Amino acid sequence: NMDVIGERIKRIKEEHNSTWHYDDENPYKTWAYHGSYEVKATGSASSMINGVVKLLTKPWDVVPMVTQMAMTDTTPFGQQRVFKEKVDTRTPRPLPGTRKVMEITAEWLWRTLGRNKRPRLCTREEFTKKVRTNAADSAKAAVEDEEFWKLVDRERELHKLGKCGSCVYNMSRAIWYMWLGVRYLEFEALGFLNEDHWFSRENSYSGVEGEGLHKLGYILRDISKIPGGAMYADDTAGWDTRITEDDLHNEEKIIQQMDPEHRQLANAIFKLTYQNKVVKVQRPTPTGTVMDIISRKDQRGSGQVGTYGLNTFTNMEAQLVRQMEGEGVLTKADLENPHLLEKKITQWLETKGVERLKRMAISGDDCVVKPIDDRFANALLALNDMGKVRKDIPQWQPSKGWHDWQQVPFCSHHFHELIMKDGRKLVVPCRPQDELIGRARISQGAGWSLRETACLGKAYAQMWSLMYFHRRDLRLASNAICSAVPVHWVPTSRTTWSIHAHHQWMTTEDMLTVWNRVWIEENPWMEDKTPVTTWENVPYLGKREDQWCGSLIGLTSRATWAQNIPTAIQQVRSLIGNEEFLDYM
Ligand SMILES: COc1cccc(S(=O)(=O)NC(=O)c2cc(-c3ccc(C#CCO)s3)c(OC)cc2OC)c1
Ligand SMILES: [Zn+2]
Ligand SMILES: [Zn+2]
Numbered sequence: 001n002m003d004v005i006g007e008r009i010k011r012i013k014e015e016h017n018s019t020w021h022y023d024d025e026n027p028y029k030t031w032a033y034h035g036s037y038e039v040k041a042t043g044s045a046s047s048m049i050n051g052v053v054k055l056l057t058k059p060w061d062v063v064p065m066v067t068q069m070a071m072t073d074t075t076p077f078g079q080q081r082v083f084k085e086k087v088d089t090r091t092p093r094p095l096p097g098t099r100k101v102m103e104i105t106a107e108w109l110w111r112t113l114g115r116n117k118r119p120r121l122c123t124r125e126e127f128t129k130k131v132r133t134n135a136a137d138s139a140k141a142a143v144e145d146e147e148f149w150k151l152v153d154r155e156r157e158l159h160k161l162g163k164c165g166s167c168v169y170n171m172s173r174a175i176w177y178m179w180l181g182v183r184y185l186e187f188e189a190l191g192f193l194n195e196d197h198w199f200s201r202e203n204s205y206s207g208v209e210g211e212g213l214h215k216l217g218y219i220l221r222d223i224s225k226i227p228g229g230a231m232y233a234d235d236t237a238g239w240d241t242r243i244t245e246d247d248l249h250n251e252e253k254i255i256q257q258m259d260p261e262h263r264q265l266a267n268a269i270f271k272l273t274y275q276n277k278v279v280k281v282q283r284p285t286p287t288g289t290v291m292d293i294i295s296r297k298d299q300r301g302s303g304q305v306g307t308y309g310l311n312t313f314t315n316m317e318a319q320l321v322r323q324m325e326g327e328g329v330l331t332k333a334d335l336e337n338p339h340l341l342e343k344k345i346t347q348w349l350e351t352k353g354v355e356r357l358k359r360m361a362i363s364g365d366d367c368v369v370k371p372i373d374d375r376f377a378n379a380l381l382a383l384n385d386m387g388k389v390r391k392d393i394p395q396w397q398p399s400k401g402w403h404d405w406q407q408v409p410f411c412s413h414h415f416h417e418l419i420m421k422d423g424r425k426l427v428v429p430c431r432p433q434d435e436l437i438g439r440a441r442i443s444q445g446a447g448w449s450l451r452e453t454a455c456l457g458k459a460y461a462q463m464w465s466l467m468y469f470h471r472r473d474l475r476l477a478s479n480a481i482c483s484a485v486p487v488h489w490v491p492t493s494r495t496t497w498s499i500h501a502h503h504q505w506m507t508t509e510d511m512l513t514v515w516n517r518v519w520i521e522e523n524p525w526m527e528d529k530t531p532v533t534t535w536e537n538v539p540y541l542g543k544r545e546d547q548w549c550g551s552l553i554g555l556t557s558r559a560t561w562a563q564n565i566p567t568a569i570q571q572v573r574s575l576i577g578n579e580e581f582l583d584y585m
Contacts, residue, residue: 182273
């Protein structure tokens, strides 16, 4: 194993020769520990509060879920405890028959995904445009520096020789150039999966990449029209820690479809930074803070370019295998059998495979499956054996599914069908309101002026008018924030990092205009393109559903808040100063 990771460790070792030591009190049990050196502690024990949102959401100052979100520890203490709880595990190797089925499904799935698309290398100018159309960070400074690209070419030459000198996963401008350089190289070799939308619904059948939150509900509603059993949405306990060496080897079959110059670089990414990895993690000691240098041959690194796509691929594969088990194609004896018959797996994939993928909505580790019948609830042999053990349920307890798509959890949301005053139906996204308010009340980082804080508040208020308008409290709060923040101020920073976020709320354009564009114009499931001219024609959940999902409607504190909200608006206005403001109440 030292033949792949050696050069990276030797460099860190040499660079930190003053403080390099082998700490014998290290907590690594499944990760290989190479040594430590001294660092300055990074992180915060709590999270910075957005005072603009907090002032306009008074009834939530006392809500437990709202307070909990305002915490979250990124210090070496918090960092060590998250590592201990999840990341320091070992997944038992899947049985020989399970490995055989997985391998056959992986080959077939890769041929299907690349039936119209051809893999290709991504470029410096693509990476440059992405960094630029995100920054408006020291990443835009690096991208503009020629010496950064020279380090990239040096590293790539080592990768062409099957060597790695500086691609280290992190749990001076030199270390940062090595980090951004590692991400460019990964973007170069595997970025095509994201950039050329290999996991779009049209290309993957089960995928939902590029759809966006406002469309996931409609996709769930279309899956419900297919004959079969209930809709299952089982959560995996730490999906990324459950990615095995057999998973990684199946994921790399994609290199067979690549041009030779591309294959070489993708192989270097797999073999050197996925199937082997050098990791840096901060640890508090009595003497101070240290950086630990660890390594391992499996698991997925969350902060990686290929993570979403390769997780979507492996989950699509794992769910097809569970469907085969559910249908009787895969038995307990088959899973234990190394000399298992490939023919029936092939026959099922070639005759039923695409139809079976159409029954699913898969986004990373997130899945919804509508099997042909309910035998699927008890088809747990392959799932547990593959290592995709379900979260908070005994291993052999049958899965509980839903006979109503509106009750199905997917991507931290559930989805409602609303009837508009004009008779038209909308499918809207919903999540517990405490999470939405809790998230909006968090400002990202320290040393942020009122302008930047208010603008982030406007971005959250505008995300709510576009996605969560059907929530009474959120439409009021959103109007209140847009009344307190100057009209010509542009929403800054991001409200979310989700791949399902398209950020149409990042504008000074009228929100009712953006609403019509998303929900009417661009909406393929809205046949009648008649615009909605007033927000009074933009619907709400029924009071009871609103209450079921976290609303404070019907509470005295909420009535007191709604009554006194112009007073709070004026206090934010008077503190921001003399600018142009608009009354939305
Ligand atoms: C990923 O892991 C996290 C962990 C903690 C925090 C966060 S976060 O605050 O940065 N984001 C979310 O909580 C969050 C947001 C969304 C969306 C919101 C609006 C959207 C739209 C549109 C139309 O284009 S999409 C979403 O949609 C599926 C899924 C999300 O989470 C699973 C993320
Ligand atoms: Zn490298
Ligand atoms: Zn809801």
